């Protein structure tokens, strides 16, 4: 067909140059969504930037999701499409999903339809977007040199990276199991351990209403062991 729709690329993505020189290969790939030929556009963001940016999805797909054609992010807010749909679902509603059909024939069919998906209807008209934003805003308002510890009382939600980074701030290896919470921490040296301890949800023995805590630990530990 004729090159009727223009490409739908966002700003951040595209880069801060007054004039880039991109190329268009027409009928130039199947897209990353709907397996369907489209005009593939691509460009180096700078002249000497090594990474080309190619337009992954087709323009119809882009419109449908109301997104960038290179970022796969909403053209307004520059955020993941799923995430934006979640946000929209949260404010003003209870349910807004954008279901892509994972069957190769049906996806094509869906792509063909000139109909916006859940979140796309909000983000297309800027007035509605603004309204959503304001509503969202409204909604808002003793050192034996062990080098090897066994840390307990670990919040189930906390990750190891948070732990290790915290330790670094207070300064290696680490072992955590979120089932047991038997955080089998180990330092690269004993001197380092000493340094740490001397520098001191931080319940910390040095093995190599606390009672109830111990019980909770106990049962959880047992369960973990059975697993």
């Amino acid at each position: 067909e004729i090159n009727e729709p223009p490409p739908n690329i966002c700003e951040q993505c595209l880069g801060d140059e007054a004039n880039i020189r991109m190329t268009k290969i027409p009928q130039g790939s199947e897209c990353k969504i709907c397996t369907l030929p489209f005009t593939l556009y691509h460009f180096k963001t700078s002249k000497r930037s090594n990474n080309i940016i190619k337009t992954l999805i087709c323009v119809r797909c882009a419109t449908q999701r109301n997104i960038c054609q290179c970022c796969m992010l909403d053209s307004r807010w520059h955020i993941p499409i799923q995430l934006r749909d979640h946000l929209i679902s949260l404010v003003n509603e209870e349910n807004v999903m954008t279901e892509e059909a994972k069957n190769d024939m049906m996806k094509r069919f869906l792509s063909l339809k000139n109909v916006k998906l859940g979140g796309a209807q909000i983000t297309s008209d800027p007035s509605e977007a603004d309204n959503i934003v304001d509503k969202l805003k409204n909604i808002l308002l003793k050192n034996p040199s062990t080098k090897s510890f066994f840390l307990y009382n670990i919040d189930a939600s906390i990750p190891e990276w948070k732990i290790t980074d915290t330790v670094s701030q207070l300064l290696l290896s680490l072992i955590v199991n979120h089932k047991a919470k038997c955080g089998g921490l180990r330092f690269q040296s004993s001197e380092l351990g000493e340094r740490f301890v001397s520098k001191i949800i931080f319940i910390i023995p040095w093995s190599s209403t606390a009672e109830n805590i111990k019980l909770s630990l106990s049962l959880n530990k047992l369960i973990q062991l059975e697993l």
């Binding site: 190329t23 030929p37 489209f38 069919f109 063909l112």
Partner: protein, 54 residues
């Protein structure tokens, strides 16, 4: 924001249009606007006597 579009000439060995591969595609109708089907008649005597013949 402003940009220059170009068409890079490609090797005349490799397929000109890599995309197109004779896909089977079902069409969505997109009859979003409704349209009537609107006939004006009401036949009772001839319209009921006929089916016995037809």
């Amino acid at each position: 924001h402003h940009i220059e579009v170009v068409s890079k000439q490609m090797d005349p060995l490799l397929p000109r249009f890599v995309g197109k591969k004779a896909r089977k595609v079902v069409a969505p109708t997109e009859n979003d606007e409704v349209v009537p089907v609107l006939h004006m008649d009401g036949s009772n005597d001839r319209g009921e006597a006929d089916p016995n013949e037809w």
